[PDB]
Each structure stands twice: as C-alpha cells, then as structure tokens.
Design a protein around this ligand. Structure first.
Ligand SMILES: NCCP(=O)(O)OP(=O)(O)OC[C@H]1O[C@@H](n2ccc(N)nc2=O)[C@H](O)[C@@H]1O
Ligand SMILES: NCCP(=O)(O)OP(=O)(O)OC[C@H]1O[C@@H](n2ccc(N)nc2=O)[C@H](O)[C@@H]1O
Ligand SMILES: Cc1ncc(COP(=O)(O)O)c(C=O)c1O
Ligand SMILES: Cc1ncc(COP(=O)(O)O)c(C=O)c1O
Ligand SMILES: [Mg+2]
Ligand SMILES: [Mg+2]
Ligand SMILES: [Mg+2]
Ligand SMILES: [Mg+2]
Lengths: 615, 616
C-alpha cells in the first residue's frame, strides 16, 4: 500500500494572471472547494497517511490548509522563483522515505486514478490519458514494454505518442534519489529543471512504465481555457464518476456498528496478503501504537502502555480482561449497573474467579460513599466496571471511581467499549490499568477487532498467572507478538485494513471534535425530545451524549415496531430499549452521523409522535 | 442488498437477420464470450443469487447456459412469437419474490450500473444515459422529481428528453404486480405489449425514478450497426472501466488467507446495517443453512445438522468445540500428529478437561490398529482430531477413524479448518458430530467468521454441560440465535457479507470442481518438485493436495529468506516450514489460484533452485 504522497505546489501560476497574483492556483475553487483540498481529501481517502506539500509562492495558503489536515507537512522551496518544479521536489525528498504518489497542484481528477496506480504491480508508474485537446499537453514516448523513453510538449520531438502525462505518478524512493542526484548535479546549468525532465533521465536506467487510461477524466488548470474545460465539462463528469462508487448511506441511530464513511468501507478492499508477512506485522504494530494514543493525554508517556488486538467482539475483549487479569489469589468486585456490568460478573462467575457484585440502578448514578466503603474493606484486589453503560446512556464517573480504586491499592479493569474515541480519555490520570474497546464503536471502523489497552507494568504483572482459556488470554497474545512480530492466529486481515483507515480518520477529526459532533447531535435530539413532551430515563447531567434512552409514550397507539418501520423508510435505524422492567426506546448518535442528519430524524420523529397524538 | 434479477430473453432478434436465425442475440460473442453470459457474470459478482431468464426463441441456448450457472432458472414463454417483452416478463413473475434487477438480454454495460442501482436508496429506478447516437433509442420524459412520465422511440412525442433507457431497471415486487395486472387487463387489445409500456403505466401511480448517468458506457445490440459500435468502441471502453476497479492480484501460496476473487473483496462494501435487524438475522440464518451443506452429501438430511457462527479465528472455533463439547463426566482422547492436534490438546489441558493424548508422527500416517486398541479400552467418551494437518499437508483418514470411534460409542470432534470446502465431505457417513472451519480457508472468503457444523442431536446433548467460558460457548451461541434470530454479540457484519459471496461462488464452482482445481495445481507443483530433485516430507498417497511440505536443500546457498523474497518480487507468497527438527518450506495452492499460475510459480522456483545449484 502507498502511505506517502508529495504535492508540488511552489509555482507562480503566472499564466492565470490576476487569479494567481495573490494565491497559488491549487486554491482555485470549483464546486465550492480549493482543487488542491479536494486532491488532499482523495489522497487521504485512499489511505495516504503523510502528504508532503512543497510550497513557495503564497505558501501561507498551504500552511493554513495544513491546519485543517494533520497529515500535511509543508516545506518551502525558498528559491521557488528561480527553480522549476524539480527544485521544489528536491526540498521535499528528505521527507519521503518509501514509495509514494507524486502529484501536480493544478489537477482535478477521478480518484480512480489513485486506486489504479496503487493497485498496479509495477513499482514506477506514470498515469497517462488519451487525447484531451486541452493545450499544453505533455506527450509521452514509450517502448514496447510501455516504459518511458521520451517526453515533450512538442509532439513532433517524439518518435511515438503513447499518451499524455496526467501529473499523478507512483515512484520508489530509489527513483526519487536518482532524480534528486541528477537535479543537484545540474543546479548551475539547468536551474529551472522540471520534474518531468529528471524523471525522463531517471527512466534511462530504472524502468518507468506508463499506464494509459484512454478515457481517464482529468484536467490541469494552467490558464483560463483549462478552467473553462474544468468548470463546464470535466468537474461535473468527475463528480458523476465518483458518485458511481457511492455506497447506500443508512443513518444508524444504534450504538455501533454505526454509519461509516465510504473510505472506511473501501479500505477493506486491498491486495490479498499473508498475515505473517513482515509488512502485515508492521501494520499490526502501527495499529497497536496508534490505538493507545486515543486513550492517553498528550503528556502521558505512550511507552507506559500497550495495545493487545484480538479477532473478537467487545464482549470478547471484556472477557479477555476478566479472564486474564485477576488471579485466584485475589478477589474481584464487579460494578453491575447495566447489561455490560452484569455481563462481566457472569463471565467472572463462569470462570470461578473470586468475586462480589456491587449492584446499582441502571439509570441513576452510583452511590460513591457505599462504593468507597466496599474498597475500604480491603477484600478486593481488582475492580471491573463500565465507563458508558450503553444499556441506558448512563455515564459512570470513572474519573472519580478508578483513581479512588487505585488509592485503595486495587487494579482497575474498565469496559470503555462505547466510550473510547467518543470522549477524551487519559488512562494515566483516570487511574485505569486495563481498558477494552472495539473497532466498530466510536472509532468508526468495521466490526471484528477487539483490543485491550494496558498499563504495561500491570500487564507484565500477569505474566505468571495460570491461563484460564487460550484464544482470549491477554498475556500470551501480547507476548507472542512482542517476540515474533506476528499475531498468534489468523487475524481479520481486511477488517484491520479498515481499522487503520478509521484510525487515520480519527486523527484527522481528533477525538475532541468527534466528541463535539456527537454532543451537537445529542443537543438536537434532547431539544426535540423536550418539545414533544417525551421523557428521558437518565438525567441529562448523567448521560454520555452517545445514546439516549427515551420512555415509550403511554398511549396504546405507540409501538416500537411502528416507529421503527417508519423511521427505516427514511433511512434511519432506531434501537429498542434494553430493560425488562421499564419500557424505553433508544436513539444513539455516533459513527459518521452529521448534525443535519439528526435534525432530519427529529422531524420524522415529530411526524410519527404527532400522528399518534403525542406532542 | 438486491438478491434477484430477471433477464427477458424470449425475442427473435429479427433485425440481426442470419445471425439470429438459429440463435438468441444474447449469445452474440464479444471478446470470446456471449454478451448475455457476460451479464450473468456481472450479476453474480454483485451478489445476485437467482437469475430468472425468460426464454422463447431458441430457448435451448439458455437452458445449456443454465447448466453452467446454477443460480439461473429458465422459464419459457411458449407464446413468444405472439407476445412482446412484457409477456415474457409475465411468465417470469411468479419466480420473483423480492426487489429485483430487470435486464434486457442484448446489453453490454459497465457493471458500475449494477452497483449504482443497488446502492441508490430509491426503490424503483431506471438506469438512463446521456445521448448515444446509436439508433433505436428509447427516450425518457421526466417530471421535476426525475420520475418517469412518458417514454417513446419518437423524440417529438415527449415533452422533454431526460435520458435514454439503458435496459437495466431496479423494481419492487409490488411494481411488478402492477405491471403484470395492467398487462393481463390488455391481453386482448395489446398482446405484444413491451415491458417499457407497462412500466410507464405503473409509473402513473407508483413513482419510478430515473438515474441518469450522463457518460454511462453501454450498448444494446439489435442490428449490425449496434454490433459495430459495441465491438469497435463500447466494449473496449467497458473493459477499461472495469479494470480500473481491479485489485492487485498477489498469488498466495500460503494456506489461508489466500488469493480471493475481487467480487469476494467488494462484497465487503455495503450499506451500514445494525446486526440485530431482521434482514441481518435472515442473512446469518442463510449462512448457517448454506455452510452446513458443503459438509453434507445431498442424500443426507440437512435438518439433522446445525451451524454455529462466531466472530473468531479457526483456533477460536477449535476452542469452541474443545471447551463446549466434553463435560467433566467424560474423558477426551486427543490425536496429536501435528501443530493443530497438539493445539487442541493444549486447549483441553488449560480448561482441565479429563483427557489423554494419542501421539503420532507429523508425517507418517497414523496406525489405525493402535488407535482402535485405544478406543476399545472404553475409557474415552470423546475424540478430538484434525482432518488436514496443514503443518505438513498430512491428511488423516477420517473416513475410517471417525466411524470407528462412533462404533466404540464416542462423540467425534473434528478440526476440518483446512479441509472443509476443499474436498467433498459428508458428516453423516464420516461419523463426525462436530466440525470446525472458518471463512478464510477453502471457502475463499475473508477472515473473521469461525464456525462449527453440528450433529443436531449431539449439539442438543451439550445443553446439560456447565459453561467453561462465555464468548466461545457453543450451546449458548446456538440457543440465543434460535430464540431471538439475533447473534449474542456484535458479529463482523461486513465479513459476513463477504462470506455470503464466497458461499455463492462455492455453490457456483462446486466443492467437487474446486477439489479438482486445487489438485490440478498440486499435480503441477509435484511434477516440478520431482524434476528438480526436491523431496517431499509426506508421501503423496497420504497428502491432502492442499499444501506441500518440501525438504529444504542442503546447500549453504539456500535460504528460505532468499527464495521467499525472490518469489515475492514475482507476486508469489510462499510459507515457511513449521517443524522443530526437520527443515522444510511449504507451498499451498488453495484460494482463487489457477493452474497456469502454479505453473508460473514452478518456472520461477526452477530459476531460483537452478541458480543455487539444485536441479542440474
Ligand atoms: N505537467 C506540467 C503542465 P504545467 O506546465 O502547466 O506545469 P505547472 O506550471 O502547472 O507546474 C507544475 C507543478 O509544479 C509546481 N511547481 C512549479 C514551479 C516550481 N518552482 N515549483 C513547483 O512546485 C507547480 O506549483 C505546479 O503544481
Ligand atoms: N429497450 C428495448 C428496445 P428494443 O427495440 O431493442 O427491444 P428488443 O427487441 O432488443 O427486446 C428487448 C428484450 O426483450 C426480449 N423479448 C422480446 C420479445 C419477446 N416476445 N420476449 C422477450 O423477452 C428480447 O429477447 C430482448 O432481450
Ligand atoms: C459498554 C459495552 N460493553 C460491551 C459491549 C459488547 O460489544 P460487542 O457487541 O462488540 O460484544 C457493548 C455493546 O454495545 C457495549 O456497549
Ligand atoms: C488445521 C488447522 N487448524 C486450525 C488452524 C487455525 O486457524 P486460525 O489461524 O484461523 O486460528 C489452522 C490454520 O492454519 C489449520 O490449518
Ligand atoms: Mg501544464
Ligand atoms: Mg500545469
Ligand atoms: Mg432496441
Ligand atoms: Mg434491443
């Protein structure tokens, strides 16, 4: 997979005259957005994790772009006025360390050119098109292996015309080295070298193939004629082509699997791979390194924590923790104030772990005096509890409970399955030793990877615990990968590709802003609940903001099924209540849901409720 | 998703003169394949499981087509000479029970059209294109909501030209009902009604939207002019469009995950769905009902068997069996003649199940005499064993071992992780009570679903047993789905969509033909092994044909790393040996690997082996 890209954007764009006197031409806007920002989104959407933008003229526009996209690094060609495009690539190259995509800044293009270059086996590969009749075409001459032998804007300087250079090229680091060595040795005589020229030179000794997509839909914008072609013809075509790959968007109001981006969905599609290959071990290592960061404050040293990934669900991860972190020499206290706390107590009981339960209401907060009293008996070495009790939307105050458990010398075992990545978390100041979550809740990937983020020292303390199971044993799963850079058994390979994409998108959003978008959706729902006269099971002060239990209207005209089927006709999936003794329904707002989508849902809810005489 | 399609294929193709005298025009060939078989392939590749073809003219071409694609059912309009296309749709209608794609038979098209209709939220939807300059165009007139209000081959008879009808339309069953009711009402006065006519009438009371894809690449073939645009321009363009979506193909010579079809890859891409929804409960039910049939002979009663699916790996599925099927009141005998037999023994011991181990060589066949003497001690209520020991490619003779165990009163627990779907199996005659496998080995899906196919009577016996774990407990996982039509926990939804496609493609290939394909590759590999002077660790007669353990060459110039890195440069992934005291490398041939591709590998293997002095 290609993880890096370079956008060459130091040019003056002089041929656009007034348009570029104050502005790089990448920041021309078609359809409401800078063309280069669209390219940045297309690159990240295909799993590019680092975008090196070589800046020069009006570099401020790009520095300000980088503020919106953490994947961008800007590097200025201070001499941009007196070099060509090769000089800008030269200041970028020290930032490139593997194979990469190389893009011009004045392009619009069908993103299927990204996919097609990434998925071609040839390592050095120019994307080319058929005839465009656009002006300023760079023509490629190719040999019988379709490899580059000449290039020129004068079609008569060439021995054949294979296609036109699009400006999107896949290259190895070694090919870049060769280009930068030829550019450097010609700093005096060829000061305005264009990157194409150095690539042609490099192609003499390293084969550089050309992939000719006859009908590839693209346009470069050097001047006003190009812009006319872009605005009137090429852009609406690109829009249509990219919408052909759009996936049916169902808005899920259940707490996960939730609505996903289509870039997370398509991240599941990749070359087949043997998961014991080094490259896949490096991907699993990167997933471990990056997952645990979403649970730590930036000032907490990451090396104090480990991630342990398993092929299993959230319940699986909870069972890993209960069944691997509490020796028979200790005693566990489980907080049961919901289905997931009750589940952990039943797991501990199945395993015959010494254990008492602290039972409390599913919708009103825990008594912390009574809880501290149970810590104070010194009977408990370990505590297992849930952060967000998805049963009702109750948020347990683990910023209070778990540091208190630590003050009593206890190890903390935390189900954060529906909390992690939806709100900021710092395991260190939260006093949390082991934390479980999954790949398909608030991180917004696909189901199938459960994981435990561990205080490394407390993880180590379990090295000599008797195993209670095999597939779900925390220490062995951790120890084997530390030793072999392989995971013990076959993992959900494609789901792990999806998880990496969801990790990149969580870094792009940041957890803080995801929390704000979740809470904005929640704010809309609660206001509409109040207007309709509906009642909330949990008091707002005590809620997670990620799911809201709503009491069922008393009128016999209501049923869950009728509201559910109506909402489903409008592409909204709602969720039943989970309590035997109290009738509720639940509306969650996680995943890719947008505030306007929750607004549209409340409109439909009001339609339905009004139709049965509620509100 | 959309599970059903209909092809109207009854007409004469008269405008094609001699080419259709003896043949339906759907069987015109471009690129070596009948255009209508090309359409069937793209339908099947997008998850369609039933393709109803309405026949008439020379219906025998379509009946022979149906022999090659089991998803096809042909139904002949006997009166095709005296109806139009709606009459053929009429005789197909009772075979359609859901929303469906409706297709003309003379089409070539970008398959993106299937994907785009399936993923559009509007339930009744005509695919349209911009102007084609093709002749015989069917023009569509649309209202301000892009819904159909008129159509004609005569441009001037319409108040507006919204686009051209491609001939691929998504409809509900209720829209089909309406169309058929209107056609029967007009049997007398409109006996040659075209299906377009009836759809326009339905659109007067049911909104039928039009999805206009301006640059959509397609062509219908009614005459020689159409055929020329198809051959010279449209078909090469579709080929290019479809190859832009191709995923890089690595040939995996490791035993799973292995090379997959791109249709299985893209089956993971779907509408987000809450797994407790009835629709997804129905999918998991379908998967259970279909997975167990690849482990049974047709003469075996599928009602005697259940499937229990989990979100775990093959080791997880083995652990499900070991930890849920043997109570402390019994005693388990584990056969250990390989890594996965040993693994089941290690799991057994961690749970403290009463057990002995029957150890044997990892590359000599087990002594059936010694094993029977162990069974005859009457000390064991349960046997656990491995069908295919992918450690070495050693295939245990379970068609002897497990019925013997049954004759001795034993319950049988079988890891068939690397055996199931690569060779015909019948659990009834094999005497197997519990059989595990996964979604990413010989069934050729994506990893994440581990499952246990159970003798129903024996599965129900385990209700009495104390739970030893929770996530991996067989009975509780079975019973919950039986009671609720939901799985206990969140499953790997998208992996299950891919498993469904892999199931559909196994049904298309058949397990017998897949065994032949695998064995075909294995033969090629074995013949090249011998030509090079390489030695196999397991005797041919005791091998599975699915993975071959090869002795590493003695020369210091050999290394697994060099051979692996050279192979990988040519898009082949090989696998290291697994054995403590014998140096081997392994070459598997499961997954979508083709024989020509195994031949290409042996050519590169000879290049490497000759390079270091092996093989003359
Ligand atoms: N294949 C090129 C057709 P064109 O001649 O229009 O090249 P450009 O003038 O559009 O420059 C190509 C890219 O190269 C960039 N560039 C140009 C000059 C320079 N000194 N540095 C650059 O990065 C520039 O910003 C732009 O994105
Ligand atoms: N949008 C269609 C306009 P066109 O005039 O090409 O219609 P065709 O003659 O090509 O037929 C359309 C389809 O309808 C089928 N058909 C036609 C006549 C008939 N009695 N039964 C059919 O199924 C036929 O085999 C063919 O595949
Ligand atoms: C708090 C909590 N814990 C555990 C789980 C179990 O997750 P899974 O269904 O993936 O087992 C969930 C499910 O919603 C959850 O919300
Ligand atoms: C016979 C056998 N049993 C068990 C396994 C373990 O399966 P998994 O890697 O999915 O855990 C394998 C996988 O190679 C196998 O071949
Ligand atoms: Mg130019
Ligand atoms: Mg340019
Ligand atoms: Mg026609
Ligand atoms: Mg036709």
């Amino acid at each position: 997979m290609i993880k890096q890209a370079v956008i060459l954007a130091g040019g003056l764009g002089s041929r656009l005259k007034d348009k570029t006197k104050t502005m790089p031409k990448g920041f021309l806007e078609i359809g409401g957005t800078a063309i280069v920002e669209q390219s940045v989104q297309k690159l990240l959407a295909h799993g590019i994790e680092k975008i090196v933008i070589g800046t020069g003229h009006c570099n401020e526009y790009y520095d300000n772009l980088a503020k919106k996209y953490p994947a961008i690094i800007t590097v200025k060609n201070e001499n941009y006025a007196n070099t060509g495009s090769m000089g800008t690539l030269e200041v970028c190259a020290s930032f490139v360390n593997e194979s990469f995509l190389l893009l011009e800044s004045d392009l619009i293009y069908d993103s299927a050119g990204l996919f097609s270059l990434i998925n071609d086996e040839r390592k050095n590969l120019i994307l080319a098109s058929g005839a465009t009749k656009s002006g300023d075409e760079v023509y490629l001459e190719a040999d019988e292996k379709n490899c580059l032998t000449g290039l020129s804007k004068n079609r008569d300087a060439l021995k054949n015309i294979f296609g036109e250079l699009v400006g999107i090229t896949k290259l190895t680091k070694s090919t870049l080295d060769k280009m930068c060595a030829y550019a450097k040795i010609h700093h005096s005589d060829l000061p305005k070298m264009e990157y194409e020229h150095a690539l042609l030179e490099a192609a003499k000794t390293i084969p550089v193939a050309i992939k000719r997509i006859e009908y590839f839909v693209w346009r470069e914008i050097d001047n006003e004629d190009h812009l006319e072609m872009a605005v009137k013809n090429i852009y609406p075509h690109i829009v249509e082509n990219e919408k052909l790959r759009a996936v049916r968007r169902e808005v899920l109001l259940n707490p996960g699997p939730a609505t996903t981006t289509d870039s997370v969905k398509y991240a599941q599609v990749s070359a087949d791979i043997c998961p014991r290959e080094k490259a896949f071990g490096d991907l699993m290592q990167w997933l471990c390194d990056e997952l645990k960061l979403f649970a730590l404050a930036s000032e907490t040293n990451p090396d104090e924590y480990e991630t342990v990934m398993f092929g299993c669900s959230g319940t699986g991860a909870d069972e890993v923790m209960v069944s691997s972190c509490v020796p028979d020499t200790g005693r566990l206290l489980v907080i049961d104030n919901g289905s997931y706390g009750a589940r952990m107590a039943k797991i501990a009981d199945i395993y015959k772990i010494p254990m008492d339960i602290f039972k409390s209401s599913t919708y009103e907060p825990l008594d912390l005096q009574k809880l501290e009293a149970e810590f104070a008996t010194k009977k408990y070495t370990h505590l297992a509890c849930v952060y967000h009790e998805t049963t009702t939307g109750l948020l347990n105050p683990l910023h209070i409970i778990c540091p208190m458990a630590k003050k009593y010398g206890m190890v903390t075992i935390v189900d954060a399955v529906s909390a992690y990545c939806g709100m900021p978390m710092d395991l260190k100041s939260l006093g949390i030793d082991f934390m479980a979550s999954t790949s398909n809740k608030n991180i917004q990937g696909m189901a199938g990877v459960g994981f435990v983020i561990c205080n490394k020292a407390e993880l180590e303390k379990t090295k000599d615990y008797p195993m209670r199971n095999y597939y779900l044993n925390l220490y062995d799963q951790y120890a084997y990968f530390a030793k072999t850079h392989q995971t013990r058994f076959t993992p959900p390979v494609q789901t792990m590709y999806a998880l990496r994409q969801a990790v990149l998108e969580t870094k792009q959003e940041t957890v803080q802003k995801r929390y704000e978008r979740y809470t904005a959706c929640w704010n809309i729902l609660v206001a509409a609940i109040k207007k309709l006269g509906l009642k909330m099971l949990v008091k707002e002060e005590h809620q997670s903001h990620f799911i809201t239990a709503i009491l069922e209207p008393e009128t016999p005209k209501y049923s869950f099924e009728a509201l559910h089927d109506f909402a489903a006709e409008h592409s909204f999936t709602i969720y039943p209540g989970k309590l035997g003794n109290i009738d509720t329904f639940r509306i969650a707002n996680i995943g890719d849901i947008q505030p306007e989508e929750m607004r549209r849902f409340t409109v439909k809810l009001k339609e339905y409720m009004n139709g049965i005489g509620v509100g």
